[PDB]
Design a protein around this ligand. Structure first.
Ligand SMILES: Nc1ncnc2c1ncn2[C@@H]1O[C@H](COP(=O)(O)OP(=O)(O)O)[C@@H](O)[C@H]1O
Ligand SMILES: [Mg+2]
Lengths: 188, 188
């Protein structure tokens, strides 16, 4: 349907938004636990409710991003808007840029936010990414993520120094989402 | 043998009859190309996220041939590749987005498993660079589809080349993409 019309998207092709939580197979634990969580989230969702999102991590091509698109489609089926952001592209358009701040605002404020592909390529990110996360915590705005790295690795990954604050941001994330590993074949 | 898998666009197919053995590692720049190549083929898998080669050097060296070689070793192992003579496409593009199919050609090149763009530079324009070219690179970055290049110029010279400030930034976001996609190897 016009489901896709309610699903906003930044820096990523809209054709990947052709997804459904019914096309995902039961094959293993990762997804069984994931969509089970997803559907409970989508059923119980209501503006302004402490609610944990998902932090999906795993190898390349297991269907992590598709899971987010899938969840967004379920929500648009509830007439709730969400936004999926290819994050690596968000941090880049931020270095080379007319307008962008009006959009960070939209990101911090959307009902449900899905940050795709966290973790690939101190730092100014202490001013941009953290605040976003902190605003969604403060306002009870559900937040999802997809990374190739898990909680342990992601920290070790963003901008290594010779600090702790990277670990402070790692805290907002696990506060915001419940991590689940997605195993399975390499769909490609 | 392995030629029905690797195809081309805008260049007589008799140029793609190559081999990594038909070459002689004469002077070093070349040594790391062949090495990069074998590494690439051995560790290649869809969605992987792996650099390609950006080979730069003066006229009559072997940039094109090398690509064809890598393209052949890749066929020896199943993988289909696609090498396109860039200057032709851009030239062609000038007037062709007019009602029709060639753009479904642009669509296929954007989505192929391995893209090899022969001799970038050596002419061309801006809505094409930044609207035709750019999106190609941005898509293949997001999907982690291997991309190779060959240019008479080193990265720093291909940028100052494309400038014809604000287009300073444009050559910037576009050069950033090439770099993120290919590791530069000088040849002589
Ligand atoms: N559950 C699924 N049902 C049908 N297609 C799927 C499913 N999951 C992933 N895909 C397909 O696989 C591809 C995406 O895998 P991807 O979302 O990129 O994994 P990452 O999200 O890389 O783990 C898409 O092009 C999509 O067509
Ligand atoms: Mg992904």
């Amino acid at each position: 349907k016009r489901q896709e019309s309610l699903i906003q998207s930044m820096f990523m092709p809209r054709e990947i938004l052709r997804a459904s939580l019914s096309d995902v197979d039961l094959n293993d634990d990762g997804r069984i636990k994931a969509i089970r969580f997803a559907e409970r989230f989508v059923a119980e969702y209501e503006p302004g409710k402490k609610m944990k999102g998902l932090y999906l991590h795993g190898s390349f091509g297991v269907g992590k991003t598709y899971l987010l698109a899938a969840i967004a489609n379920e929500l648009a089926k509830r007439n709730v808007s969400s936004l999926i952001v290819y994050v690596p592209e968000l941090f880049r358009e931020l270095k080379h840029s007319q307008t962008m701040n009006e959009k960070l605002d939209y990101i911090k404020k959307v009902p449900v936010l899905m940050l795709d592909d966290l973790g690939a390529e101190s730092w100014v990110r202490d001013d941009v990414f953290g605040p976003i996360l902190q605003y969604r915590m403060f306002e009870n705005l559900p937040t999802f993520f997809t990374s190739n790295f898990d909680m342990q690795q992601l920290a070790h990954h963003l901008t290594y120094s010779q600090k702790v604050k990277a670990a402070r941001i790692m805290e907002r994330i696990r506060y915001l989402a419940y991590p689940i590993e997605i195993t399975g074949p390499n769909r490609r």
